[PDB]
């Protein structure tokens, strides 16, 4: 695995940054990102997937609309549900609605779900080096909220499962000034941090960085 | 915790009260009522493209209200907006999302 890795640089593999508003649908943005990338990595066709869908329907997979979720379970949702449509047909609204899923509209699909083993940050690097941008959930703090640039370290956050509260998308990795970090896409718009992206301390499972990470295997 | 749930609930802290006090005028502009002292008692948090606050404020005496405020990211400007409120709440009542 190379010391560096930028999925955004390899080609046209990362979809625009976007925000989830006051709705707790970060996991869905975590979800949509992994899958838009994969299909892009496999087909070269760039598509934007509707997070609203996961908000209105990924219920049977332990998700909870604007009140919580997890990429892995949502990934299962799209396998079993036979797909996900885009936005132009299922636009973002940031609130719990009722399911408007329409089969003949799905434009992206999922064959398998590769769940990185618990706390195995190394495997996460493997998956990102050879396969696809990974979705994970760390532990945010008011501390993290002020991020503007640089490698975000943290002593206030604990690592364990419990305080894990914000899924995002690992899109690369590297090292600067001797400090190995993760390049990450966030779901808060092109104004926060490094244009939606933020760098975070790698190598120490920073803020439970690999407690529940996974990536999709698109059926294409 | 799930990646987007509300946190477990913790006792109200001095900043929560600031939030409720800064917010009290909005309850009123919406319910056109006038409350005495609205004491924060408990709250839960939820990370979004900011933070949503779920506070249990004692605004009467033996009567509790549940406010929901949204505090923006430290870079997008603006203040605490009361996004919703639940009238008639028991002291024991679990704070929930909405």
């Amino acid at each position: 695995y190379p010391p560096s890795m930028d999925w955004r640089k390899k080609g046209n593999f990362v979809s625009p940054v976007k925000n989830q508003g006051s709705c707790g649908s970060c996991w869905t943005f975590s979800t949509t990102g992994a899958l838009e990338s994969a299909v892009a990595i496999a087909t070269g066709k760039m598509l934007s997937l509707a997070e609203q869908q996961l908000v209105d329907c990924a219920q049977n997979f332990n998700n909870h609309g604007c009140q919580g979720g997890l990429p892995s379970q949502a990934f299962e949702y799209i396998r079993y549900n036979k797909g996900i449509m885009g936005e132009d047909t299922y636009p973002y609204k940031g609130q719990d609605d009722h399911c408007k899923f329409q089969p003949d509209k799905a434009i992206a699909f999922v064959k398998d779900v590769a769940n990185i083993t618990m706390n195995d940050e190394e495997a996460m690097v493997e998956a990102v080096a050879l396969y696809n941008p990974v979705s994970f959930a760390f532990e945010v703090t008011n501390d993290f909220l002020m991020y503007r640039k640089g490698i975000y370290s943290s002593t206030s956050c604990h690592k364990t499962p419990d305080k894990v509260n914000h899924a995002v998308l690992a899109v690369g990795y590297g090292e600067e000034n001797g400090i190995p970090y993760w390049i990450v896409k966030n779901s808060w718009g092109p104004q926060w941090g490094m244009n939606g992206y933020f760098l975070i301390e790698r190598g120490k499972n920073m803020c439970g960085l690999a407690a529940c990470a996974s990536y999709p295997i698109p059926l294409v | 915790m799930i990646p987007g749930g509300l946190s477990e609930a913790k006792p109200a802290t001095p900043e929560i009260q600031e939030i409720v006090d800064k917010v009290k005028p909005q309850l009123e502009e919406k319910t056109n009522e006038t409350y005495g002292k609205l004491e924060a008692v408990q709250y839960k948090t939820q990370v979004v493209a900011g933070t949503n606050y779920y506070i249990k404020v004692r605004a009467g005496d033996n009567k509790y209200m549940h406010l929901k405020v949204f505090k923006s990211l430290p870079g997008q400007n603006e203040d605490l907006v009361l996004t919703g409120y639940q009238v008639d709440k028991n002291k024991d009542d679990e704070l929930t999302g909405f």
Binding site: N62, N63, H64, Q67, G68, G69, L70, S72, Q73, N115, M118, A137, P161, V164, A211, C212, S214 | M1, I2, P3, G5
Partner: peptide, 8 residues
């Protein structure tokens, strides 16, 4: 198995 992060 079921990834541990999702509950609720």
């Amino acid at each position: 198995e079921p990834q541990n992060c999702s509950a609720t």
